[PDB]
């Protein structure tokens, strides 16, 4: 709300200029209305009497001729100054439209794109996009202003019809009116946006919902006949070709389609699809290929033949065969939302991406999935960097460059056999989501440490001190590294704990069973950490 004031200041300026231009047009109408009555006086005086003496007739005729030439000189002057006023009106309307064009481009091409990008990022666990009531109010002011100016210009056109003065004013009005229709088309087509987009990575037969909105709908007389909006699922090639306006239905049948509703209190025109269900799908990989939900409608503005065909595209959606593949499919979505270009041709993502750029997305989605504000720290980030690029470095700035190809992210296996770097990271995400979210928030799980790295870090600690790291041995497991003096002369080796283990006994109970483990990493004792989570 710092440089939002810039927008509202420009809006007050626009309001003032349209108001004073309307006042100018009122004065011009009064001027013309008086001019035509004086011109009718000239018509009555035009061309002229009954029987009189030749002495009085000369006087009468010369007085009438005087009145006639005077009235002609008065009319030519009045017409001239009237035309001056008219061209001034056209000039002021032009100026207002130019600045309104700048403002509309500011809102539609920047702020709306910013909000849509907020939405895009929220799909990866980022901050929520927020409410469009600010953008809705802005678009209401835009529509109000431009429609009022259209009314003023058409009124000037009608006024020019009744008393035509040659000049260059008709071309000015024609040029300005075309600009008006162009602006209206841009506004109406650009403010048909998906408020809550439908949740990507969806299976067939499952009910999902999305909500689309018309930001300008409150006014502009679209609400008078709330149009029907139809949703249909189309492939990526279909979306690409449609944006180029081809013709082709690329993803079989969709269950629903609905009509818009207007909340007078909220003052919003929106379409709520609460019960859509995907029942069939046409169909490189069974899971990488992305689709999109297309919403389209058509509506009229007031009493005009002006009909707008509008369409909008959801951000890319992936269709899952069965839950087994779902864990992988989100990876695809993760890249798109993370790395979609601003003016991208539909669903085109870079294959390169630098490491810190991927780090920001991984960290964001991690804090989202584990439902905590702990998140990824620098040491964790170096751990995953050493995991991805087999490279001997323990400083983050050494990995400040480096490009993570999509393949090495999710297609090429690591030096192990884990389903690429993404599967291991999604595995730790899932194990902490379903089982160990509280222990992650509490700080008991260091996790992002290595066996030897956990070792030398843990040697000096007193006997009985443990720490839990995420196993590179198994995908979804965590292992324990412990401190005892005899240790190596003893046997004792434990298997990593996975979801299967955690389902029957749970982590706190497993640690309770092991009496020889008594301190969490630094000085924290076991009971202090796990007392509330032990099973009474």
Numbering used by the authors: 138 to 184, 188 to 388, 392 to 426, 433 to 685
Article passage:
Unphosphorylated STATs form an anti-parallel dimer/monomer equilibrium, and upon efficient recruitment to the cognate receptor–kinase complex, are phosphorylated on a specific tyrosine residue, which promotes parallel dimerization by conformational rearrangement. The activated STAT dimer translocates to the nucleus, initiating transcription of target genes and altering chromatin involved in loop formation in enhancer-promoter landscapes. The canonical domains of the STAT family are all present with the coiled-coil domain (CCD, S138-T331), DNA-binding domain (DBD, F332-V470), linker domain (H471-D591), and SH2 domain (Q592-P685). Archetypical STAT-type SH2 domains are comprised of an anti-parallel β-sheet created by three β-strands (conventionally labeled βB-βD) surrounded by three α-helices (αA, αB’, and αB), which are also observed in STAT5B.
Notably, STAT5BN642H was identified and validated as a severe oncogenic driver mutation. To investigate whether STAT5BN642H perturbs the protein structure, we crystalized the mutant using the same domain boundaries as the  wild-type protein (A136-Q703). The crystal structure of STAT5BN642H was solved to 3.21 Å with a similar space group to the wild-type protein. The βD strand containing N642H was observed with excellent electron density and showed two distinct conformations. In one STAT5BN642H conformation, the βD strand associates securely with the βC strand forming additional H-bonding partners, not observed in the wild-type conformation, thereby fully completing the anti-parallel β-sheet. In this conformation, the H642 likely coordinates the phosphate, similar to that observed in other SH2 domains such as Src and phosphatidylinositol-4,5-bisphosphate 3-kinase (PI3K). The second conformation showed the N642-containing βD strand dissociated from the βC and βB strands, resulting in an incomplete β-sheet. This partially completed β-sheet places the SH2 domain in an open, potentially inactivated, state. Alternatively, it is also possible that this conformation is more capable of activating STAT5B either through facilitating interactions with the C-terminal region and dimer interface or providing greater access to the pY pocket to increase phospho-ligand association kinetics. Notably, the affinity of the phospho-peptide with the full-length STAT5BN642H (Kd = 15 ± 1 nM) was ~6–7-fold higher than wild-type (Kd = 102 ± 11 nM).
